[PDB]
Amino acid sequence: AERPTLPIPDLLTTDARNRIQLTIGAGQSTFGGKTATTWGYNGNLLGPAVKLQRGKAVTVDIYNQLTEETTLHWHGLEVPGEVDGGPQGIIPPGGKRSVTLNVDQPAATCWFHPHQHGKTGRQVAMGLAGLVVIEDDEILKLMLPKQWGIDDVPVIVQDKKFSADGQIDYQLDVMTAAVGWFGDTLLTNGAIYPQHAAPRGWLRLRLLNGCNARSLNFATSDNRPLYVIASDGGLLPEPVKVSELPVLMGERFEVLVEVNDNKPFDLVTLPVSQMGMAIAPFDKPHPVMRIQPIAISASGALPDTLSSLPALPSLEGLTVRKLQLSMDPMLDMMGMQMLMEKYGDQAMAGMDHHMNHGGKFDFHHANKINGQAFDMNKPMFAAAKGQYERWVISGVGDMMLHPFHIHGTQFRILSENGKPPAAHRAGWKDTVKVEGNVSEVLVKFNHDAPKEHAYMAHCHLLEHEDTGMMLGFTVG
C-alpha cells in the first residue's frame, strides 16, 4: 500500500475581531489501523500553526474542553509572565481563557504545548502540541521557500507507545521519572512514515522535536546535506551546511534540502547516545518521512546571507546565576535498574564505555534544581529586566540528558555542556544541552513576570520536569 501523505497543520491567522480560537479537546485517532483516544487543539491530535507578525498584537481565545485542567504555553515566544501559560496559567475544564500576544521578536518557528503542573508529560503524550510561525519584514525579503504545505513544511517528530488495546500507554513512574517516557513508534505530524510531495529545487523543513524525552538526529537516506537556516529563536546569519542535525526535546531548526527529479529520499533520524533510546527499531537509522520529488520547479532561494547576529557583549560585570540540576541518587539508580532489567544491555547501546517509606522517598519530587523540587508557591529568584545575565546550568552529578529551557527569552549559548556551541547552535536559542557537564548562556528578559505568573526554567525531558526539575523566577 502507499504511504499516507504528510499531514499539514492549518496555518491560522486572526479574524476581523483580531481573534484566533483554540479549542482543547479529546477525540480519536488511528495508528496502524487501531483507534486510540487522543487530544488536540482544533482537532483530535496535535494542532494548527498559529501565524504571528512582529509588531502586531493578536488575541487568542482558548477553550478547554477537556475534563481536567490544562495550561497553554507559547514555547519560544517572548511574552510577559501573565500570558506565558506556565503551570500557574490554569484553564478550568469547560472554561475559557483569553490572552493578548504582543509579538516583538524576529521571525522564527516556535511552538505551543500544555504546562499543567506535574502532568505536562502526559498531556503532551496524549496529543497536545501546536506550532507558531512568526514573520517579520526582514524574512520575506529573502524569498525563501514559502508555500505552506508544498515547499515550506512543518515536521513535528514524536514517539509514542501503545497498549495492546491500541490506547496510548503513558506512565509517569520510577523508570520514566529517571530516563523519560519513550516508545517504539515514530510519528511525523501524527502519521506513521508519511510521504511529502515536494517541487524540484529547495524544500524548507521546519523541524520540531516534540518527543517527551527522546533526542533525535536528522539526516537524509542518501547523504544529501541539510542547510540550516534557523534555530529556535530565528534565522542564523548565514546557512550552515550539515550532514547530520541533532535536535533536543522542544528544539526547532529550519533547514533547506535539495529536491531533484526521479530521486525520492527519506528524512531519517540516526541512533543517539542517550540511555534507552537505541532500542529496536531505533538502534538503526529510522525513517521520518519520504520526500517524493515532483517535476514542477520550486521557486525558493537559499541566500548567501540571512540576517545579522549581533556581537556577544563583554561578560565582566554581569550577574552570574548558578543552576545546579540534580536527581535523587536512589531513584536514579532504581529507574536505571528497571530500564536495564526490562531491555537489557541494549538500553545503554552507544553510550560511552520496595516498601513504602513515606513522602520524602517519593519519586514525584525526586528531581531538583538547587536542592529543591519545583515549588509553584516560591519563585527561586528575581532576575533583572532589560539586562543581560550569565546563567550557569550544571548537570554534574548524574549522566542523564537535560535539555534546559528558559521561558521568556531567546538566549545566546556561551558554552554547551563544556564546549563552545556548534555554528548552527550559536544563534538564538531557547534550549541548551546539559549532560554530565556544564553550560552557560547569555540571557536577557524584555518583559515582566510576577510571582503569581512566574517564568519557568526547566529540563525539557518532560518526566524530569514533572517530578521537580523546574524552578520559577520573576522578572521586574
The answer to whether the annotation marks 447 as part of a ligand binding site is no
Examine residue 268 and tell whether it contacts Cu ion (CB under 5 A). no
Examine residue 75 and tell whether it contacts ligand [O-] (CB under 6 A). yes
Q: Cβ(298)–Cβ(151) under 8 Å? A: yes
Least gap, CB of 160 to ligand O (angstroms) = 20
The answer to whether the annotation marks 460 as part of a ligand binding site is yes
CA 312 – CA 333 distance, rounded (Å): 40
Examine residue 75 and tell whether it contacts Cu ion (CB under 5 A). yes
The answer to whether the annotation marks 196 as part of a ligand binding site is no
CA 410 – CA 104 distance, rounded (Å): 12
Instruction: Give the rounded distance of the alpha carbon of 26 from its chain centre.
Output: 22
CA 295 – CA 421 distance, rounded (Å): 39
Examine residue 122 and tell whether it contacts ligand O (CB under 6 A). no
Examine residue 196 and tell whether it contacts ligand O (CB under 6 A). no
Least gap, CB of 459 to Cu ion (angstroms) = 3
Contacts of ligand [O-] in 111-140 (CB under 6 A): 115
Examine residue 73 and tell whether it contacts ligand O (CB under 6 A). yes
Least gap, CB of 35 to ligand [O-] (angstroms) = 29
The answer to whether the annotation marks 73 as part of a ligand binding site is yes
Stretch that binds Cu ion, among 229-237, 314-322, 376-384, 463-471 (CB under 5 A): 463-471
Using CB under 5 A, pick the residue from 48, 246, 250, 300 that binds Cu ion: 250
Examine residue 447 and tell whether it contacts ligand O (CB under 6 A). no
User: What is the β-pairing status of strands 130-135 and 96-102?
Assistant: unpaired
Nearer to ligand [O-] by C-beta: 78 or 136? 78
Contacts of ligand [O-] in 376-405 (CB under 6 A): 405
Examine residue 402 and tell whether it contacts ligand O (CB under 6 A). no
Examine residue 97 and tell whether it contacts Cu ion (CB under 5 A). no
The answer to whether the annotation marks 365 as part of a ligand binding site is no
Nearer to ligand O by C-beta: 6 or 50? 50
CA 223 – CA 218 distance, rounded (Å): 11
Which residue do the cell numbers 512543518 mark?
154
The SS3 of residue 352 is: coil
In 10 A of CB 55, how many CB atoms?
9
Least gap, CB of 330 to Cu ion (angstroms) = 17
Q: Cβ(235)–Cβ(307) under 8 Å? A: yes
The SS3 of residue 65 is: coil
User: What is the β-pairing status of strands 57-64 and 19-31?
Assistant: parallel
Neighbour-count burial for 193-230, b at 16+ CB within 10 Å, e otherwise: bbbbebbbbbbbbbbbbbbbbbbbbbbbeeeebbbbbb
The answer to whether the annotation marks 459 as part of a ligand binding site is yes
Examine residue 407 and tell whether it contacts ligand O (CB under 6 A). yes
Instruction: Give the rounded distance of the alpha carbon of 28 from its chain centre.
Output: 24
CA 45 – CA 41 distance, rounded (Å): 7
Nearer to ligand O by C-beta: 29 or 409? 409
Last residue before each break in the chain (C–N > 2.5 Å): 353
Nearer to ligand O by C-beta: 182 or 455? 455
H-helix or E-strand spanning residue 27: strand 19-31
H-helix or E-strand spanning residue 462: helix 462-466
Counted residue by residue, the chain has a size of 476
DSSP bridge partners of 325: 369
Site string (292-331) toward Cu ion, x via CB under 5 A: ----------------------------------------
Examine residue 460 and tell whether it contacts ligand [O-] (CB under 6 A). yes
CA 56 – CA 137 distance, rounded (Å): 12
Examine residue 119 and tell whether it contacts ligand O (CB under 6 A). no
Examine residue 75 and tell whether it contacts ligand O (CB under 6 A). yes
Q: Which residues bind ligand [O-] (CB under 6 A)?
A: 73, 75, 115, 405, 460
As annotated, the binding site for Cu cation includes 73, 75, 113, 115, 402, 405, 407, 458-460, 464
Q: Which residues bind ligand O (CB under 6 A)?
A: 73, 75, 405, 407
As annotated, the binding site includes 73, 75, 113, 115, 402, 405, 407, 458-460, 464
